[PDB]
Amino acid sequence: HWGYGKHNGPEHWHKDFPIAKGERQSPVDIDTHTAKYDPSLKPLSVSYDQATSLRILNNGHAFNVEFDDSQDKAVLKGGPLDGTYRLIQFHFHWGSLDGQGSEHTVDKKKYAAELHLVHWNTKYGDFGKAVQQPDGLAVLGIFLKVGSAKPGLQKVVDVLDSIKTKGKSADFTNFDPRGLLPESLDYWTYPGSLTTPPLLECVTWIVLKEPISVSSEQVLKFRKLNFNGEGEPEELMVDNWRPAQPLKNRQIKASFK
Ligand SMILES: CCCC[Se]C[C@H](O)C[Se]c1ccc(S(N)(=O)=O)cc1
Numbered sequence: 001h002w003g004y005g006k007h008n009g010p011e012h013w014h015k016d017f018p019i020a021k022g023e024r025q026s027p028v029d030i031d032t033h034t035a036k037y038d039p040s041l042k043p044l045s046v047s048y049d050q051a052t053s054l055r056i057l058n059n060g061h062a063f064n065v066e067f068d069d070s071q072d073k074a075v076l077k078g079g080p081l082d083g084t085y086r087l088i089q090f091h092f093h094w095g096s097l098d099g100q101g102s103e104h105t106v107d108k109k110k111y112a113a114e115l116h117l118v119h120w121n122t123k124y125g126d127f128g129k130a131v132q133q134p135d136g137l138a139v140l141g142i143f144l145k146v147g148s149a150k151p152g153l154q155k156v157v158d159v160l161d162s163i164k165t166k167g168k169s170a171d172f173t174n175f176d177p178r179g180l181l182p183e184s185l186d187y188w189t190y191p192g193s194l195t196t197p198p199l200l201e202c203v204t205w206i207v208l209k210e211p212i213s214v215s216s217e218q219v220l221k222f223r224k225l226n227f228n229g230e231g232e233p234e235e236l237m238v239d240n241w242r243p244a245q246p247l248k249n250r251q252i253k254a255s256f257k
């Protein structure tokens with residue numbers, strides 16, 4: 001099965017998922033000098049005041065914080081988007097060392113980690129339908145750098161001991177994802193894909209320019225997670241990131257000058 005090892009990692013994925021070599025794959029390097037300011041892009045609208053978190057799951061590739069998406073409770077609108085996109089889950093990608101871990105890069109700079117807040121277009125009715133559509137998903141990407149602690153991340157860090165291994169889940173109610181945002185909502189945007197199999201070309205990527213700061217102790221706790229199931233030999237959950245893919249016939253747009 002696919003993963004991030006020597007034998008099943010990103011360079012192998014094309015054999016089961018040929019769209020891996022497609023025309024709008026993610027992530028990409030954001031060349032900040034080549035991205036064009038698009039004065040017609042709107043401010044992002046992030047409306048998370050009524051978000052209902054439910055559960056946290058170790059899926060063997062990352063951990064997902066899942067939300068109630070059965071109503072318009074936590075939505076993303078505006079920016080490059082037409083219509084309303086409902087928050088379904090967030091997860092991270094991170095490194096074994098602070099100098100790697102992000103999926104997107106900025107002028108080839110790798111951050112320690114990257115947060116993905118995943119949303120689906122409500123005109124398609126459910127997430128499974130939305131991933132079959134070129135405008136089905138909107139993923140809000142936020143870089144993490146190591147420095148000062150992020151206080152709004154700590155409730156996530158403290159539960160990870162309870163979901164160490166693949167298939168473990170824990171109740172995770174009343175978590176406020178607004179605590180993970182930076183101050184500025186300035187962003188880059190481009191059409192892309194899921195960054196894991198099945199690599200479907202269904203994502204409007206919205207990547208915030210301002211990173212959030214997390215502490216070394218916070219990311220060290222991410223790196224204590226396991227890819228393996230309980231009672232299997234330990235394989236630390238680190239370097240769960242896909243490298244940058246060819247931009248091909250795409251333009252990255254900036255919301256800011
Ligand atoms: C069977 C249900 C529908 C088929 Se999609 C299969 C599975 O649910 C992957 Se969900 C996924 C979401 C976000 C990302 S990312 N890193 O943000 O681009 C990656 C994957």
Ligand SMILES: [Zn+2]
Pocket residue numbers: 091092093116195
């Ligand atoms: Zn992701």
